[PDB]
Design a protein around this ligand. Structure first.
Ligand SMILES: [Zn+2]
Ligand SMILES: [Zn+2]
Ligand SMILES: [Zn+2]
Ligand SMILES: [Zn+2]
Ligand SMILES: [Zn+2]
Lengths: 72, 297, 525, 186, 585, 187
RNA sequence: UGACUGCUCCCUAGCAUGCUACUACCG
RNA sequence: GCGGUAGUAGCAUGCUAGGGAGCAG
């Protein structure tokens, strides 16, 4: 199950990256840090909290329309 | 490396080697030039000569395609292929070749050594890229002309406006006055620096140097030459007379010092070119300065 | 200033879902994902270049280095070298970057095309009378790894490579074309290459143990004197082609171009203090010379620093006495004793050397008495001749030869039974293979059908896992086989529903059964 | 290769050779149909050689251009493939702390900065109406991302501080509603 | 890689010589290639001989080398002709259905758009043909405008005047503002920022929309855009519901628009209704009535401009609360009372320029005649709504056809829906003639309007009849006549109460000559509807097909509340018009 | 292959052969007019099947010299590029401040590392954190390399301008932190 | 913006060589 | 009845070249 978290963190940082987030040096620094700390974790309950903290970086923009993409 | 040929304007890659200026020639058109002259050497990206180590043959039809090379019969591998055949010499773009049925106009310019007035009847009564080739051939062979002559060594210096001067060996001598202005340059131990613009006349050698300088021993002169590079635009555009002098600025006031001028300019803005009948001192130098005020824009 | 980042890898969700369909990645399994694409922020380039602060001015024991250079050169007698003309050099892949500033106008192909062989030869013969300082770009790498430290290579200008190739390539290609030597560059691991290499390194050593060490920050902590010695050993083959001033000026060009050059990082020129540029024309061989140098001096230190009165073998005592004399009492080379020490080393301390990776089969009962190098000797030698501390957590030792090197070029060794006899196969790290399956640059990775040739090679490298005692390891290889089958018979399906025509015949069923992969580890070929 | 003219000639030749060997005919007259028969596979097995070549040449060009088309339409939809893949894996993860913030975001409460993890730092969340305020905020505690945050500032959209118990129902059509709650992790 | 037009099967070839390059199906592509000079076809790579430095580019002219395509002059011994089998070589070579008669498609593609036959093609075609047609028109016309000079203002004399030349070899753009330029200035290197301008009879009269003052070297061209393809149809396959379900029946109503509520009731029982909207028949009033009748509607108000939707926003907040209207004006100065940049809005007005793509409730489209099939499919490509309405009338005004040469196209085939109210009949009508009285209205009803619009009011004898002739002489892109301009003041003099009017005139430079004679304002003939006075003076100054055709200055005659002037030098429709005639002084 | 001397010979050989075969005269008819055709594979033996091998070699050679012509045009282009780069980068050289330091060298050779030091008219400091900014670029002017520089524009990692008022202590955590302070040599 | 090497698999092309069959001519 | 050469096709091996990819230091 931790492997699911690491793979989805890879995907998350990819989508943040193509949202041009790396044009804000400190934001990209924090995102890179969280992503590299998820890939190195060894217990799934700190990877999950760094994952919510990393996803909040995406939920705080206005580039990805969220309700349409939760078509379920 | 690759452009459009004169007699064809197709895109070729072949330049007549024995020809002086070496213009781009088109495969069929190049063959037409090669069939009627001693211009029998042709350069492509590489020169068409037998690259068998240490050969002598250099005529074009004298060679056959030997794979990665060009050979004479005395060198050709069993599998050969004559370069100059088919009525079309082997080069790039061997398909797009149009030629001209009578190119002895071109060959005549190329085989023209420029001796008689017939030569310049050729140079003018020719066609166009012929015309630029002609003028440029004149210039080329004349700057090669001037240097068939001695090196004007001032080898003693006696007085001012006079020199003791000899020249090099075997060469006739340049003429007497200033259409042939020299521009010598001095040496040190090794190479060749500055002297200036000079010419030598009836002394005892009378030199009329343009700038100030005083010469020493070993001081030499020749008519230093340049590199005439080819010429693009036509001698004169295909001109025509406009319908109104539009785009040109009609001025209100005028100077009638040049009342012989304003009726002369008015259609000149209604036209591309006008060469004027300008007899000596007929306000011709005055003429162009009148329009200067008429159209100060 | 320019701030260059590193992107994350693309996820290959189809292969991952397939892997978890076959029951992988279950909690508490041994094979788990540890190799990823680690992303890097802006100030990652220079924060890596700054590691050259680990390169300190090191003076070397000269009377010992002058002997070690003779022994190390003796390790290189089997080859032949010299200068070659411009029409004899070989350049695989002309479409690679040409350094700075040449990378503004085209790749290396442009500069190998625009200069005729005579221009190249004039340029080469120019650098035997002049010094051409050059610039070096520093580039970040985009590759899978197990640690988040950024990686960086030195893009050297075309003007340096173009001439270093003509200087060195004859010898460099005579090294890569020799089998059974100490340097094992060029020797393939397939078709029984691994078994032959290991049986060669285990030549006849009497109480054999295997040993392997590790150079911390090998490229950035390498002293300049050892780089110069490496280049001087590589240039000892030019005794007829080059004159003395020519050899010095080529050495000077080498130093000015790949030792203390001007590094162009970010958008700025800095000075490089020392250590190897990892992207020059002779890195993988200079590293081997440096590796052999350090091993030889470890042996010299281990034999000279032993209570001579306690040695019982009265031949080794006299060898120690003569070794001290040859170091500190003699002034010119003593070729007979150089040969004798080299013979002693090859008898009791056989090596297998790739560019700073090494295996050693050594006489255990000599190293126990301090007559050859142990691992503490390597620790001491790197401490005082390399300015790094080598912790014994990165150096392995093995006392059972029937399970070979614990590691060499990132491969473990298994003694399996092929046909009728027992051979040594190199198996990788299952996490590495799975990671190369899951994470990749997009289109290379995400859709397989566009590139099954990838999974075929990955299954080639993952074959020996079939012979592992552990069972998840074998399941890696069988998973790759079933995935290739799925890719193929869905490509034909897509191009049938996109069509009405498909494979009238194929013969690609070989790619999903092991007889095609097995053949790559049996010796005929 | 059944539908080509050479097959008919070949059938004729083989019928002839069968008539020959079955009749026990001659020596040279049955030598007629292999100096005129084995030639019938000298220009049957060659015309049926090059077209059988073109057969798979065409298919290995078609599959090349198919792979090119697929690879050029795959790298031109990344922006969307990536996001849909991300959200599929997200809803597959099934974690409460992530589902909380994703539902909130899909209606309204987006944060304004990275959700901090320490028992200290400040978090600023946009509450867009009152109905939403009901579900998250109950008095002084803020439940968001499966944690508790004591509120310290709630400020209207026109930047004017608004203390807490001011907020209720019909007294909510009183404030510029994109409120911005500040809070600290419990 | 998509579906071909004539086939809808997934293909990969695009006709290269064809202008807009639609996806074509293997057999279907071959059918297109056999009948035209469209003889170049692009697949993932272009089908041209890639032997280094060749010339051949026709398709059948090539054979499949292996990894390449060659001519016969280049083909390797092992070749394979690309165009054969009655099926050109491309992806999906199996799924090809074609159409037996595609000379419809070839005809659109080989259509250079010169005659009215071209637009008979553009409408009487079939569908993806229709979008291809409209898009081809637009493409070739934005390529049209830039075959012309670069308008360099190279001296500046005074304000409202310029010294201006252009580039070489090119003819010159016309005189007025259907061709509005948008020049931009340079520095030393590149090109940044002038504005929206047009040049008219001076001496160069420029009517810049924004404030600016120009310098030397200042240049102008009609800067163009990139017309990208369309998606939705011009109009959905519509149908009439069984009850107005899902729509909100309101209790109370305003009988100011009692001519309106019976009109809306079935519109919720139906997808689309284009209405018979004669000029000033409460048509702008019409859509605002439903606004109150169904205040729950996200109703899509669109027109050809915020000069036309301007009229839809005229009574917007005057009738609806404020914050429930919005208009998207992209980064043009028109109406800005609204909140801007809010699509999720109860009432969203906009133009076909830039309302973003959503889904709404009931569409209301002003300007249907002048807009064609292109922007016709735009609003539905914009938006998939509950139901649809088009306000306006083909009885107004077509578009200016820059390339139509021979013989202007019918009023009736303006667009795919314009035929419908002439083949199916008018879905709505409004005869509420709030504007013109018994003067003109029925004389326009006996014109084209079905004897259909009743009298508003008395006939005060203020719209006028003048039986004249005049003398005209031509120039660049206008026509100047003062025998009638002389009649203008001659008309305008005998009562100084005459001249409280706006001058109407086709060749609006004829007002650039008239404005200096009278001081009277200008009326553009075609961009006129929506704007009008009770008093308008009109010199038609021409009787040609440009001029006194049925329904052009039709929009100019009905400008009067009560009193227009018509010096009908034409015998075209003078034989009809029933107004006060006097002697010509 | 139709336009060769062998095609006419094949036409005549076969016209005669089938003519006399429809005549069906002799056994010598078939023998000679079937041994002459068999010189009909000697007819267009190579007059159509070894030359065809030249239509190979000529094609290949023409392709190779096509390629070499390109390779020689790319060379001239890159030569123009290199030399215009040199001639456009020297014109920046500032030629009075550097002619003066060179003439004081005893022989004309100066280390390269001092040329930007003694003759550059613009400095660019890269500062990682505020504390380092304090010991170096403090104030609107500073001193370095035994010269005095005056600050101008200060930008951060995102290349947007920073006014010198914002580089406080507590305001520092809101700055993208490797500031690039560019300055000019003062006089 | 992509370094220097080494090995390996897959696809295509060319050439020669090598092997086998069919046909032809002559001795 | 054999030999030889010439052709053509099939088949193989090898070498070079071109392209796609994988691993290693
Ligand atoms: Zn010539
Ligand atoms: Zn020769
Ligand atoms: Zn040498
Ligand atoms: Zn077309
Ligand atoms: Zn071609």
């Amino acid at each position: 199950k931790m492997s699911d978290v690491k793979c989805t963190s890879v995907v998350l940082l990819s989508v943040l990256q193509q949202l041009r987030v790396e044009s804000s040096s400190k934001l990209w620094a924090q995102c890179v840090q969280l992503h590299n700390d998820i890939l190195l974790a060894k217990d799934t309950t700190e990877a999950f909290e760094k994952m919510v903290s990393l996803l909040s970086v995406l939920l705080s923009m206005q580039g990805a329309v969220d309700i349409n993409k939760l078509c379920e | 490396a690759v452009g459009a040929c004169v007699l064809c304007n197709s895109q070729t890659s072949l330049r007549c080697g024995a020809c002086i200026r070496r213009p781009f020639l088109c495969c069929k058109c190049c063959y037409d030039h090669v069939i009627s002259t001693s211009h029998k050497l042709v350069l492509s990206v590489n020169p068409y000569v037998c690259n068998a180590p240490g050969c002598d043959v250099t005529d074009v039809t004298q060679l056959y395609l030997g794979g990665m090379s060009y050979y004479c019969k005395s060198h050709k591998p069993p599998i050969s292929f004559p370069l100059c055949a088919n009525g079309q010499v082997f080069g790039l773009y061997k398909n797009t070749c149009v030629g001209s049925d009578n190119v002895t106009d071109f060959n005549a310019i190329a085989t023209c050594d420029w001796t008689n007035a017939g030569d310049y009847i050729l140079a003018n009564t020719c066609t166009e890229r012929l015309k630029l080739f002609a003028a440029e051939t004149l210039k080329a062979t004349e700057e090669t002309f001037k240097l068939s002559y001695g090196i004007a060594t001032v080898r003693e210096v006696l007085s001012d406006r006079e020199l003791h001067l000899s020249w090099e060996v075997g060469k006739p001598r340049p003429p007497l006055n200033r259409n042939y202005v020299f521009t010598g340059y001095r040496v040190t131990k090794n190479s060749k620096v500055q002297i200036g613009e000079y010419t030598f006349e009836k002394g005892a050698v009378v030199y009329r140097g343009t700038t100030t300088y005083k010469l020493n021993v070993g001081d030499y002169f020749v008519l230093t030459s340049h590199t005439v590079m080819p010429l693009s635009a036509p001698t004169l555009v295909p001109q025509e007379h406009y319908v109104r002098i539009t785009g040109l600025y009609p001025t209100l006031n005028i100077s009638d010092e040049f009342s012989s001028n304003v009726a002369n300019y008015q259609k000149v803005g209604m036209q591309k070119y006008s060469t004027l009948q300008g007899p000596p001192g007929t306000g011709k130098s005055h003429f162009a300065i009148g329009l200067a005020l008429y159209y100060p824009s | 200033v320019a701030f260059q980042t590193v992107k994350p890898g693309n996820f290959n969700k189809d292969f991952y879902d397939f892997a978890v369909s076959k029951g992988f990645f279950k909690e508490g399994s041994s094979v788990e994902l540890k190799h990823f694409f680690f992303a890097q922020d802006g100030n990652a380039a220079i924060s890596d270049y700054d590691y050259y602060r680990y390169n300190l001015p090191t003076m070397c024991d000269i009377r010992q280095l002058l002997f070690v250079v003779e022994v190390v050169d003796k390790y290189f007698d089997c080859y032949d070298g010299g200068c070659i003309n411009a029409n004899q050099v070989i350049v695989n892949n002309l479409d690679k970057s040409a350094g700075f500033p040449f990378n503004k106008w085209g790749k290396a192909r442009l500069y190998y095309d625009s200069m005729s062989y005579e221009d190249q030869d004039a340029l080469f013969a120019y650098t035997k009378r002049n010094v051409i300082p050059t610039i070096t770009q520093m580039n970040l790498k985009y590759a899978i790894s197990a640690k988040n430290r950024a990686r960086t290579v030195a893009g050297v200008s075309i003007c340096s490579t173009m001439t270093n190739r003509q200087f060195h390539q004859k010898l460099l290609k005579s090294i890569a074309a020799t089998r059974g030597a100490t340097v094992v560059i060029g020797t393939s691991k397939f078709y029984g290459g691994w078994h032959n290499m290991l049986k060669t390194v285990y030549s006849d050593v009497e109480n054999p143990h295997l040993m392997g060490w590790d150079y911390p920050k090998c490229d950035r902590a390498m002293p300049n004197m050892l780089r110069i010695m490496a280049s001087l050993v590589l240039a000892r083959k030019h005794t007829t082609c080059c004159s003395l001033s020519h050899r010095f000026y080529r050495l000077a060009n080498e130093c000015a171009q790949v030792l203390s050059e001007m590094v162009m990082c970010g958008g700025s020129l800095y000075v490089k203090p020392g250590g190897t540029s990892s992207g020059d024309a002779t890195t993988a061989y200079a590293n081997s010379v440096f590796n052999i140098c350090q091993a030889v001096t470890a042996n010299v230190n281990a034999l000279l620093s032993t209570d001579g009165n306690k040695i019982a073998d009265k031949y080794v005592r006299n060898l120690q006495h003569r070794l001290y004399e040859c170091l500190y009492r003699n002034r010119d080379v003593d070729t007979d004793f150089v040969n004798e020490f080299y013979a002693y080393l090859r008898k009791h301390f056989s090596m297998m050397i790739l560019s700073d990776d090494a295996v050693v089969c050594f006489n255990s009962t000599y190293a126990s008495q301090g007559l050859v190098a142990s691992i503490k000797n390597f620790k001491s030698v790197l401490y005082y001749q390399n300015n790094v501390f080598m912790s014994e957590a990165k150096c392995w030792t093995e006392t059972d030869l029937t399970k070979g090197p614990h590691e060499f070029c990132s491969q473990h060794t298994m003694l399996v039974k092929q046909g009728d006899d027992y051979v040594y196969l190199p198996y990788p790290d299952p996490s590495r293979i799975l990671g190369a399956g899951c994470f990749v640059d997009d289109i290379v990775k995400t859709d397989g059908t566009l590139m099954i040739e990838r999974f075929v090679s990955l299954a080639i490298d993952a074959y020996p896992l079939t012979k592992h005692p552990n069972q998840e390891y074998a399941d890696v290889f069988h998973l790759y086989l079933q995935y290739i089958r799925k890719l193929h018979d869905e490509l034909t399906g897509h191009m049938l529903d996109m069509y009405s025509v498909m494979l009238t015949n194929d013969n690609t069923s070989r790619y999903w059964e092991p007889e095609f992969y097995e053949a790559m580890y049996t010796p005929h070929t | 290769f059944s539908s080509l003219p050479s097959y008919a000639a070949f059938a004729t030749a083989q019928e002839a050779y069968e008539q020959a060997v079955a009749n026990g005919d001659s020596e040279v007259v049955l030598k007629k149909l292999k100096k005129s028969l084995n030639v019938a596979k000298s220009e049957f097995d060659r015309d049926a050689a090059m077209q059988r070549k073109l057969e798979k040449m065409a298919d290995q060009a078609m599959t090349q251009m198919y792979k090119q088309a697929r690879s050029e339409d795959k790298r031109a939809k990344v922006t969307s493939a990536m996001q849909t893949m991300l959200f599929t894996m997200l809803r597959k993860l099934d974690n409460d702390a992530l589902n909380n913030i994703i539902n909130n975001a899909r209606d309204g409460c987006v944060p304004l900065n990275i959700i901090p993890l320490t028992t200290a730092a400040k978090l600023m969340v946009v509450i867009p109406d009152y109905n939403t305020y009901k579900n998250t905020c109950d008095g002084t505690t803020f439940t968001y991302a499966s944690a508790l945050w004591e509120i310290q500032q709630v400020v209207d959209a026109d930047s004017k501080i608004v203390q807490l118990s001011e907020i209720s129902m019909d007294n909510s059509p009183n404030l510029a509603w994109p409120l911005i709650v500040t809070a600290l992790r419990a | 890689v998509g579906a071909c037009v004539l086939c809808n099967s997934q293909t990969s070839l695009r006709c290269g010589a064809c202008i807009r390059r639609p996806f074509l199906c293997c057999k279907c592509c071959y059918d297109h290639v056999i009948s035209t000079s469209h003889k170049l076809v692009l697949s993932v790579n272009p089908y041209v001989c890639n032997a280094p430095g060749c010339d051949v580019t026709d398709v059948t002219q090539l054979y499949l080398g292996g990894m390449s395509y060659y001519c016969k002059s280049h083909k390797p011994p092992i070749s394979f002709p690309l165009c054969a089998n009655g099926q050109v070589f491309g992806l999906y070579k199996n799924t090809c259905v074609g159409s037996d008669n595609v000379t419809d498609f070839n005809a659109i593609a080989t259509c250079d758009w010169t005659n009215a036959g071209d637009y008979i093609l553009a409408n009487t075609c079939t569908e993806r043909l229709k979008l291809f047609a409209a898009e081809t028109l637009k493409a070739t016309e934005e390529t049209f405008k830039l075959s012309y000079g670069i308008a360099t203002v190279r001296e500046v004399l005074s304000d409202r005047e310029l010294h201006l030349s252009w580039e070489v070899g090119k003819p010159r753009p016309p005189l007025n503002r259907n061709y509005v330029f948008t020049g931009y200035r340079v520095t030393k290197n590149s090109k940044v920022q002038i504005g929206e301008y047009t040049f008219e009879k001076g001496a160069v009269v420029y009517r810049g929309t924004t404030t600016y003052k120009l310098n030397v070297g200042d240049y102008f061209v009609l800067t163009s855009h990139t017309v990208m393809p369309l998606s939705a149809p011009t109009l959905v396959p519509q149908e009439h519901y069984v009850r107005i379900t899902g729509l909100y029946p309101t209790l109370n109503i305003s009988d100011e628009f009692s001519s309106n509520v019976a009109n809306y009731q079935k519109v919720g029982m139906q997808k689309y209704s284009t209405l018979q909207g004669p000029p000033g028949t409460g048509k702008s009033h019409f859509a605002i009535g439903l606004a109150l009748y169904y205040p729950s509607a996200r109703i899509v108000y669109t027109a050809c401009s915020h000069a036309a939707v301007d009229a839809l926003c005229e009574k917007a907040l005057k009738y609806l609360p404020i914050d429930k209207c919005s208009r998207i004006i992209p980064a043009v100065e028109c109406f800005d009372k609204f909140k801007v940049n809010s699509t999720l809005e109860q009432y969203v007005f906009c133009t076909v320029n830039a309302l973003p793509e959503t889904t709404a409730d009931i569409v209301v489209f002003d300007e249907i005649s002048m807009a064609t099939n292109y922007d016709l499919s735009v609003v539905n490509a914009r938006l998939r709504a509950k139901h649809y309405v088009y306000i306006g009338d083909p009885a107004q005004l077509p578009a200016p056809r820059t390339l139509l040469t021979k013989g202007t196209l019918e009023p009736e085939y303006f667009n795919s829906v314009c035929r419908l109210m002439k083949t199916i009949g008018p879905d709505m009508f409004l005869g509420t003639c709030r504007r013109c009285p018994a003067e003109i209205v029925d004389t326009v009803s006996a014109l084209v309007y079905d004897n259909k619009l009743k009298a508003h009011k008395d006939k005060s004898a203020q719209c006028f009849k003048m039986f004249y002739k005049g003398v005209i002489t031509h120039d660049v892109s206008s026509a100047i006549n003062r025998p009638q301009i002389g009649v203008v003041r001659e008309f305008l003099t005998r009562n100084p109460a005459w001249r409280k009017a706006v001058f109407i005139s086709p060749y609006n430079s004829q007002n650039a000559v008239a404005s200096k004679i009278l001081g009277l304002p200008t009326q553009t003939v075609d961009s006129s509807q929506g704007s009008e006075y009770d008093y308008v003076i009109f010199t038609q100054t021409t009787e040609t097909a440009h001029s006194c055709n049925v329904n052009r200055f039709n929009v100019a005659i009905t400008r009067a509340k009560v009193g227009i002037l018509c010096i009908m030098s034409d015998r075209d429709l003078y034989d009809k018009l029933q107004f006060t005639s006097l002697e010509i002084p």
